[PDB]
Scaffold this motif. Structure first.
Motif, PDB file in Angstrom:
ATOM      1  N   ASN A  40       3.967  12.005   8.958  1.00  0.00           N
ATOM      2  CA  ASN A  40       4.884  12.864   8.221  1.00  0.00           C
ATOM      3  C   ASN A  40       5.655  12.078   7.161  1.00  0.00           C
ATOM      4  N   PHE A  41       5.349  10.784   7.035  1.00  0.00           N
ATOM      5  CA  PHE A  41       5.993   9.875   6.102  1.00  0.00           C
ATOM      6  C   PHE A  41       5.097   9.621   4.889  1.00  0.00           C
ATOM      7  N   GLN A  42       3.832  10.055   4.964  1.00  0.00           N
ATOM      8  CA  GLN A  42       2.858   9.719   3.934  1.00  0.00           C
ATOM      9  C   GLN A  42       3.322  10.186   2.558  1.00  0.00           C
ATOM     10  N   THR A  44       6.320  10.635   1.351  1.00  0.00           N
ATOM     11  CA  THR A  44       7.565  10.116   0.802  1.00  0.00           C
ATOM     12  C   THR A  44       7.628   8.589   0.793  1.00  0.00           C
ATOM     13  N   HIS A  45       6.679   7.913   1.452  1.00  0.00           N
ATOM     14  CA  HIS A  45       6.680   6.457   1.474  1.00  0.00           C
ATOM     15  C   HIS A  45       6.735   5.914   0.048  1.00  0.00           C
ATOM     16  N   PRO A  46       7.746   5.097  -0.334  1.00  0.00           N
ATOM     17  CA  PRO A  46       7.803   4.563  -1.698  1.00  0.00           C
ATOM     18  C   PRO A  46       6.584   3.744  -2.108  1.00  0.00           C
ATOM     19  N   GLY A  47       5.924   3.114  -1.128  1.00  0.00           N
ATOM     20  CA  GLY A  47       4.705   2.371  -1.396  1.00  0.00           C
ATOM     21  C   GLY A  47       3.486   3.270  -1.600  1.00  0.00           C
ATOM     22  N   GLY A  48       3.664   4.588  -1.442  1.00  0.00           N
ATOM     23  CA  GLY A  48       2.578   5.545  -1.601  1.00  0.00           C
ATOM     24  C   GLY A  48       1.831   5.803  -0.293  1.00  0.00           C
ATOM     25  N   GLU A  59      -2.756  -3.387  13.071  1.00  0.00           N
ATOM     26  CA  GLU A  59      -1.532  -4.119  12.822  1.00  0.00           C
ATOM     27  C   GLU A  59      -1.456  -4.511  11.349  1.00  0.00           C
ATOM     28  N   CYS A  60      -0.310  -4.184  10.731  1.00  0.00           N
ATOM     29  CA  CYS A  60      -0.052  -4.466   9.327  1.00  0.00           C
ATOM     30  C   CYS A  60       1.188  -5.348   9.137  1.00  0.00           C
ATOM     31  N   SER A  61       1.601  -6.075  10.188  1.00  0.00           N
ATOM     32  CA  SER A  61       2.808  -6.897  10.177  1.00  0.00           C
ATOM     33  C   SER A  61       2.866  -7.833   8.972  1.00  0.00           C
ATOM     34  N   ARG A  62       1.760  -8.534   8.695  1.00  0.00           N
ATOM     35  CA  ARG A  62       1.763  -9.525   7.632  1.00  0.00           C
ATOM     36  C   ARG A  62       1.953  -8.853   6.275  1.00  0.00           C
ATOM     37  N   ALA A  63       1.210  -7.769   6.022  1.00  0.00           N
ATOM     38  CA  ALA A  63       1.348  -7.024   4.778  1.00  0.00           C
ATOM     39  C   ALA A  63       2.752  -6.432   4.642  1.00  0.00           C
ATOM     40  N   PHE A  64       3.295  -5.913   5.748  1.00  0.00           N
ATOM     41  CA  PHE A  64       4.636  -5.349   5.758  1.00  0.00           C
ATOM     42  C   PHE A  64       5.657  -6.402   5.325  1.00  0.00           C
ATOM     43  N   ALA A  66       5.068  -9.166   3.684  1.00  0.00           N
ATOM     44  CA  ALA A  66       4.805  -9.700   2.356  1.00  0.00           C
ATOM     45  C   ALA A  66       5.464  -8.846   1.273  1.00  0.00           C
ATOM     46  N   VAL A  67       5.653  -7.553   1.560  1.00  0.00           N
ATOM     47  CA  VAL A  67       6.330  -6.618   0.666  1.00  0.00           C
ATOM     48  C   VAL A  67       7.827  -6.929   0.572  1.00  0.00           C
ATOM     49  N   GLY A  68       8.372  -7.622   1.578  1.00  0.00           N
ATOM     50  CA  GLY A  68       9.808  -7.827   1.656  1.00  0.00           C
ATOM     51  C   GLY A  68      10.530  -6.511   1.917  1.00  0.00           C
ATOM     52  N   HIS A  69       9.996  -5.704   2.838  1.00  0.00           N
ATOM     53  CA  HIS A  69      10.641  -4.445   3.174  1.00  0.00           C
ATOM     54  C   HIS A  69      12.111  -4.678   3.499  1.00  0.00           C
ATOM     55  N   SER A  70      12.943  -3.781   2.964  1.00  0.00           N
ATOM     56  CA  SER A  70      14.387  -3.905   2.990  1.00  0.00           C
ATOM     57  C   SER A  70      14.966  -3.536   4.353  1.00  0.00           C
ATOM     58  N   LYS A  71      16.267  -3.807   4.521  1.00  0.00           N
ATOM     59  CA  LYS A  71      16.994  -3.377   5.705  1.00  0.00           C
ATOM     60  C   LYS A  71      16.966  -1.854   5.781  1.00  0.00           C
ATOM     61  N   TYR A  72      17.092  -1.211   4.618  1.00  0.00           N
ATOM     62  CA  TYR A  72      16.997   0.232   4.531  1.00  0.00           C
ATOM     63  C   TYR A  72      15.640   0.713   5.068  1.00  0.00           C
ATOM     64  N   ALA A  73      14.545   0.089   4.605  1.00  0.00           N
ATOM     65  CA  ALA A  73      13.209   0.456   5.060  1.00  0.00           C
ATOM     66  C   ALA A  73      13.090   0.290   6.574  1.00  0.00           C
ATOM     67  N   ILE A  74      13.594  -0.837   7.084  1.00  0.00           N
ATOM     68  CA  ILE A  74      13.450  -1.120   8.505  1.00  0.00           C
ATOM     69  C   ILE A  74      14.223  -0.088   9.327  1.00  0.00           C
TER      70      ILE A  74
HETATM   71  C1  HEM Z   1       7.354   3.186   8.927  1.00  0.00           C
HETATM   72  C2  HEM Z   1       6.811   2.197   8.223  1.00  0.00           C
HETATM   73  C3  HEM Z   1       7.234   1.972   6.825  1.00  0.00           C
HETATM   74  C4  HEM Z   1       8.401   2.327   6.208  1.00  0.00           C
HETATM   75  C5  HEM Z   1       9.564   3.063   6.830  1.00  0.00           C
HETATM   76  C6  HEM Z   1       8.312   1.883   4.858  1.00  0.00           C
HETATM   77  C7  HEM Z   1       9.353   2.091   3.934  1.00  0.00           C
HETATM   78  C8  HEM Z   1       9.314   1.582   2.646  1.00  0.00           C
HETATM   79  C9  HEM Z   1      10.405   1.566   1.743  1.00  0.00           C
HETATM   80  C10 HEM Z   1      11.792   2.108   1.997  1.00  0.00           C
HETATM   81  C11 HEM Z   1       9.980   0.982   0.591  1.00  0.00           C
HETATM   82  C12 HEM Z   1      10.813   0.740  -0.649  1.00  0.00           C
HETATM   83  C13 HEM Z   1      11.081  -0.765  -0.800  1.00  0.00           C
HETATM   84  C14 HEM Z   1      12.051  -1.283   0.240  1.00  0.00           C
HETATM   85  O1  HEM Z   1      13.064  -0.619   0.551  1.00  0.00           O
HETATM   86  O2  HEM Z   1      11.858  -2.392   0.804  1.00  0.00           O
HETATM   87  C15 HEM Z   1       8.622   0.628   0.780  1.00  0.00           C
HETATM   88  C16 HEM Z   1       7.855   0.016  -0.185  1.00  0.00           C
HETATM   89  C17 HEM Z   1       6.559  -0.409   0.081  1.00  0.00           C
HETATM   90  N1  HEM Z   1       5.853  -0.329   1.232  1.00  0.00           N
HETATM   91 FE1  HEM Z   1       6.471   0.415   2.865  1.00  0.00          FE
HETATM   92  N2  HEM Z   1       7.131   1.268   4.668  1.00  0.00           N
HETATM   93  C18 HEM Z   1       6.422   1.286   5.806  1.00  0.00           C
HETATM   94  C19 HEM Z   1       5.162   0.775   6.096  1.00  0.00           C
HETATM   95  C20 HEM Z   1       4.398   0.098   5.161  1.00  0.00           C
HETATM   96  C21 HEM Z   1       3.226  -0.602   5.436  1.00  0.00           C
HETATM   97  C22 HEM Z   1       2.611  -0.725   6.799  1.00  0.00           C
HETATM   98  C23 HEM Z   1       2.766  -1.129   4.245  1.00  0.00           C
HETATM   99  C24 HEM Z   1       1.558  -1.944   4.071  1.00  0.00           C
HETATM  100  C25 HEM Z   1       1.645  -3.038   3.335  1.00  0.00           C
HETATM  101  C26 HEM Z   1       3.686  -0.744   3.225  1.00  0.00           C
HETATM  102  C27 HEM Z   1       3.587  -1.055   1.883  1.00  0.00           C
HETATM  103  C28 HEM Z   1       4.651  -0.889   0.992  1.00  0.00           C
HETATM  104  C29 HEM Z   1       4.578  -1.355  -0.407  1.00  0.00           C
HETATM  105  C30 HEM Z   1       3.401  -2.031  -1.069  1.00  0.00           C
HETATM  106  C31 HEM Z   1       5.762  -1.048  -0.973  1.00  0.00           C
HETATM  107  C32 HEM Z   1       6.229  -1.322  -2.383  1.00  0.00           C
HETATM  108  C33 HEM Z   1       5.457  -0.562  -3.457  1.00  0.00           C
HETATM  109  C34 HEM Z   1       5.852  -1.123  -4.801  1.00  0.00           C
HETATM  110  O3  HEM Z   1       7.050  -1.403  -5.046  1.00  0.00           O
HETATM  111  O4  HEM Z   1       4.979  -1.312  -5.676  1.00  0.00           O
HETATM  112  N3  HEM Z   1       4.675  -0.008   3.830  1.00  0.00           N
HETATM  113  N4  HEM Z   1       8.218   0.995   2.051  1.00  0.00           N
END
Ligand code: HEM
Ligand code: CL
Length: 88
Positions: A40-42, A44-48, A59-64, A66-74
């Protein structure tokens, strides 16, 4: 408590109809492999949505990380938790 899922089950959740991803949570005791149902997140996910489908059933831990997902994201992740993966 908690719900455990086998990799045999997790690995099936590979479609946009039911999309699971696994991310190791190094902040929790035991560093559990947390399983997230992000179906249900597909939309709205900012990463698409495509990038979620890529790692579906795995498991996508390493990719996750590498993005530097934020505190907000976590913070936003917890709502999608369904359980933890069986241990290595
Ligand atoms: C429940 C799991 C996830 C949540 C809640 C989530 C949430 C977010 C959020 C909030 C952002 C915006 C940037 C930030 O705040 O750090 C983001 C960006 C991104 N996420 Fe995730 N994410 C999830 C899982 C993943 C996974 C598994 C991947 C695989 C690599 C991924 C790939 C990305 C990428 C590539 C971006 C940045 C896109 C860009 O700026 O070009 N995400 N995600
Ligand atoms: Cl995490």
């Amino acid at each position: 408590e908690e719900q455990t899922f086998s990799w045999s089950e997790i690995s099936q959740h590979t479609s946009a109809n039911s999309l699971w991803v696994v991310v190791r949570d190094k902040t929790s005791p035991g560093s559990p492999l947390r399983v997230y149902d992000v179906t249900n997140f597909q939309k709205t996910h900012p990463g698409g949505h495509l990038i979620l489908l890529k790692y579906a059933g795995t498991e996508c831990s390493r990719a996750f990380a590498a993005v530097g997902h934020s505190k907000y994201a976590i913070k936003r992740m917890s709502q999608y938790r369904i359980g933890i993966a069986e241990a290595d």
